[PDB]
Design a protein around this ligand. Structure first.
Ligand SMILES: CCCCCCCCCCCCCCCCCC(=O)OC[C@H](COP(=O)([O-])OCC(O)COP(=O)([O-])OC[C@@H](COC(=O)CCCCCCCCCCCCCCCCC)OC(=O)CCCCCCCCCCCCCCCCC)OC(=O)CCCCCCCCCCCCCCCCC
Lengths: 68, 68, 221, 119, 65, 99, 119, 65, 99
């Protein structure tokens, strides 16, 4: 509603009222999801990597076949 | 042996004795059902260091000598 | 060993049998390694939907009441009823003494007064517990219908349609995926890589520093 | 996802946590508890959780799902299959996003770079 | 404590190390007049829980019950 | 480390009594009004709210329920769909969320 | 160095280690065990380890260092003075180079910045 | 163990938690034939220590002793 | 955490014997020469060193002792004062410390 620049008092209430173990849990969640983000993106790069047997091939070269 | 230096650390057995090392001149003996005092009746605070293994030291000396 | 059913299906164990020799068999295991990374990536591209759709917000100040569950202690009422019946047997077993011996006149006179007070407590607790359970049951039903009509509109948002269209796109895509060869190589799903890569390219931007971006309502596991 | 028939038992043990569970290989002895006749190839018994599934299909083909499937040898096969795929899905996710929890990972106890030794 | 995630070496409460011990109450009248064991039946739900029934009485009157 | 070890951030005072160990008092502990004085105070607030603070209440309750949603785009959908097309910043000023 | 007569006892207790010693104030009761007459001002008894030093001087002035100083009241004063300045020197260095070991330090359990909470 | 820096809760070796126990040799001939207690007098200094005396014999000859 | 937990970096093989738990073998363990064969090999080295490796030894022993000092400035002071003015890089080549 007011933007981040006008929320210092509300940010200080979190650091004061939340117990220290809760702040350590909040700090660790950001570090875990940063790790999980890099892991999901490394899977993306390996998945979206074009192998040597698919050079220049697009969806037009796919055969009209299904799983069966 | 001199009176051990006053140490407020103690461990109760039956009831909280509220041990005060400054309330008496000579420290009363510890009874099994009353109290256990802190370890080191005659002990001071020092800083110590473990000694690295001899083979680990020989590799450090070889690196420094090869470095210089 | 996650993605078990996916890996078993890609290996063909649903319709055929693996080669009986370790050489070709172990190559076939490593051949689905690329496809698992593709299918894992596809399942992390789902668009968000309102969380207040099938789940009330537990952080709402309305639930600060910390109400408990009113119960009827059937076992307690049944025990105390049997203990009261035990007193009635003790009087009946000793009827002639309680009735004729004047030394027991006070027990004869005040036994029913105590028995009524004992019954009064047994039934009072049961009756009061019964009223509280009925008050609890009728409130959660009435309050729930008020919250349904209040949040019905959230099902009219386009995010619900965007979510279903993505799921149907994944179903049609995975149906087009097929095994192409039996050389026990990664190229056995050569055309399927193009299909899944086109799906991933459809909902993300590959030429970004972070193609998969984090948002609190995202997919991690 | 395990891309082989066999896995190192220690690679799925925790290093900085108490080890209260293992990830054992498929219990081949349970296959001999089935009294009826069936055809099973040895090339399918080592891959994780799949033997229990094939046993469940054999039991659900011989018997049904009502009053005949409810025998000790057939219910344990269905329970092992359901439990195996649940543990392996949990260990697989923990292997993907928490690789430093297991023995054998270089991040469980990181070895420092030589620049950190100050020599 | 074990289920809560704390492995336990040894057993009992006669702590060998640097911990306070709590022996059983001496079964003599002196300590039996000063102390008494914690009765679990005296730990209760706060009576403010009964004030939630105010919602029920108001909902009944709103619905014409 | 001692199993009975706590770290307290506010001052406490312990009793100097034999056979007992407890917190007998808190420094600079001021007693506010009694439970009865607070009750009379709250009755006056609830009475004025009952007599003079019930008109136009249905509209403010809808604005409050919309602002408890997770995402802002759902709040704007709630205000437009349920609150007769109210503005985000205009309703935030009514409820008192604007600085 | 403590720049006052009094110090908070909790500020010299460890937060992440077992507390086996304290840094107590001067034992004024030992001052009454001296049998001879001496002049002592109350303005010197609270500063750390100095009371035991003055008691040692009073005992070494009344008696010497041979066969007369060897009495329980005088030897405990010298032992307390030597032990006090040793413990305070160790606690002083630990307070200077390991301030995070003690209760009350903002680095014993650091509170994170708001930028680390991801809000 | 306590002096080495490990605080001890409880006491004994009958571990309540997730640890292996060793109950002690059953005093029956079956276990008394397979097992025997560790004799401390059998843990010795390595005899290679005696080879340092070679330094003494060579020094005595160098000094003309 | 189990108290009897160990992380080993080399392969071991545990014996599958009742009532006993131990390491019965090490995989791919190669047995070298016996204690007597090593003794005969070492004597051939010590005999050559005794007969033909004792001339000009005092100079090399002084260079070796100087290079066991802590700082380099003390090594140079040792070479200049004790070893007859030897050069640092030249003495390091004799001792085999140069690459
Ligand atoms: C390790 C094992 C663990 C297992 C667990 C169980 C352990 C065993 C428990 C055994 C004790 C209970 C015995 C239950 C019956 C067992 C059969 C038996 O008695 O032994 C054979 C017994 C023979 O005993 P014997 O050892 O061979 O020789 C006896 C001696 O010669 C001398 O003859 P005697 O007549 O003088 O001897 C009397 C004899 C036997 O006398 C009897 O007749 C037994 C009567 C027992 C009734 C107990 C109270 C039940 C009240 C009736 C409830 C009915 C509800 C029905 C609801 C729908 C209908 C409206 O002894 C007793 O009285 C036993 C009573 C035990 C004390 C119970 C007092 C409880 C008060 C404390 C409260 C505790 C809370 C729990 C209460 C649980 C209540 C359910 O057979 C008979 O007595 C035949 C009786 C035929 C006429 C009776 C017709 C029914 C009249 C019922 C009384 C009505 C009272 C008013 C109604 C009150 C409610 C409205």
């Amino acid at each position: 509603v007011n933007g981040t620049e006008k929320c210092n008092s509300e940010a200080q209430d979190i650091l004061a009222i939340c117990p220290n173990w809760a702040l350590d849990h909040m700090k660790e969640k950001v570090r875990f999801y940063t790790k999980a983000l890099a892991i999901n993106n490394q899977t993306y790069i390996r998945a979206m990597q074009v192998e040597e047997y698919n050079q220049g091939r697009t969806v037009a070269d796919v055969a009209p076949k299904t799983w069966i | 042996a001199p009176n051990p230096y006053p140490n407020g650390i103690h461990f109760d057995r039956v009831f909280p004795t509220h041990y005060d090392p400054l309330a008496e001149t000579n420290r009363t003996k510890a009874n099994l059902q009353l109290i256990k005092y802190a370890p080191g009746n005659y002990s001071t605070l020092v800083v110590t260091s473990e000694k690295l293994p001899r083979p680990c030291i020989r590799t450090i000396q070889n690196y420094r000598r090869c470095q210089m | 060993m996650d993605n078990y059913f996916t890996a078993i299906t890609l290996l063909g164990l649903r319709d055929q049998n693996l080669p009986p020799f370790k050489d070709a068999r172990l190559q076939r295991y490593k051949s689905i390694k690329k496809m698992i990374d593709l299918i894992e990536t596809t399942t992390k591209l789902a668009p968000p939907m309102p969380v207040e759709l099938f789940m009330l917000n537990p952080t709402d100040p309305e639930w600060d009441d910390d109400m408990t569950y009113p119960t009827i202690t059937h076992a307690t009422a049944l025990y105390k009823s049997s203990a009261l019946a035990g007193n009635l047997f003790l009087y009946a077993y000793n009827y002639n003494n309680f009735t004729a011996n004047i030394r027991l006149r006070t027990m004869r006179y005040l036994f029913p007064v105590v028995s009524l007070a004992i019954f009064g407590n047994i039934y009072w607790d049961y009756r009061s517990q019964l009223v509280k359970v009925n008050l609890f049951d009728e409130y959660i039903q009435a309050r729930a219908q008020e919250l349904v009509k209040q949040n019905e509109y959230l099902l009219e948002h386009e995010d619900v349609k965007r979510y279903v269209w993505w799921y149907e796109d994944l179903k049609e895509t995975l149906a087009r995926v097929h095994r192409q060869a039996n050389n026990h190589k990664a190229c056995d799903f050569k055309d399927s890589e193009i299909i899944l890569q086109d799906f991933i390219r459809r909902y993300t931007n590959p030429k970004d520093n972070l193609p998969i971006k984090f948002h609190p309502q995202g997919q991690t596991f | 996802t395990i891309f082989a028939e066999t896995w190192e038992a220690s690679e799925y043990q925790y290093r900085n946590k108490a080890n209260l569970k293992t990830l054992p290989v498929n219990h081949l002895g349970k296959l001999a508890e089935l009294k009826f006749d069936f055809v099973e190839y040895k090339a399918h018994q080592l891959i994780a959780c799949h033997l229990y599934e094939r046993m469940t299909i054999h039991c659900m083909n011989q018997y049904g799902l009502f009053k005949d499937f409810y025998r000790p040898e057939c219910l344990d096969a269905q329970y092992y299959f359901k439990t195996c795929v649940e543990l392996n899905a949990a260990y697989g996710i923990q292997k993907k996003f928490f690789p430093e929890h297991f023995v054998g990972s270089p991040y469980a106890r990181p070895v420092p770079q030589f620049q950190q030794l100050g020599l | 404590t074990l289920r809560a995630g704390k492995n336990i070496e040894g057993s009992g409460q006669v702590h060998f190390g640097y911990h306070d011990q709590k022996w059983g109450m001496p079964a003599i009248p002196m300590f039996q007049l000063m102390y008494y064991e914690l009765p679990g039946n005296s730990i209760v739900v706060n009576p403010c829980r009964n004030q939630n029934y105010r919602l029920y009485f108001e909902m009944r009157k709103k619905l014409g019950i | 480390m001692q199993n009975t070890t706590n770290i307290v951030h506010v001052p406490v005072h312990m009793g100097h009594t034999h056979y007992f160990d407890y917190i007998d008092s808190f420094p600079k502990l001021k007693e506010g009004p009694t439970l009865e004085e607070n009750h009379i105070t709250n009755q006056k607030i609830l009475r004025e709210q009952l007599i003079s603070g019930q008109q136009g209440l249905e509209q403010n309750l809808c604005l409050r329920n919309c602002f408890k949603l997770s995402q802002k785009r759902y709040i704007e959908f709630c205000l437009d769909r349920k609150c007769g097309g109210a503005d985000f910043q205009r309703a935030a000023t009514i409820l008192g969320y604007t600085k």
